[PDB]
Amino acid sequence: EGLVEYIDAEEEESILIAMQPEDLEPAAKRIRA
Residue nearer to other proteins on the CB measure, 4 or 31: 31
The number of helices, as runs of H, and strands, as runs of E, in the chain is 0, 0
Q: How many other C-beta atoms lie within 10 A of the C-beta of residue 27? A: 3
Q: From the list 1, 14, 22, 25, which residue makes contact with other proteins (rule: CB under 8 A)?
A: 14
Minimum distance from residue 24 beta carbon to other proteins (Å):
11
9 sits near other proteins (criterion: CB under 8 A):
no
Vertex 19: Cα angle to 24 and 6 (nearest 5): 120
Asked if 10 is part of the footprint of other proteins (rule: CB under 8 A), the reply reads no
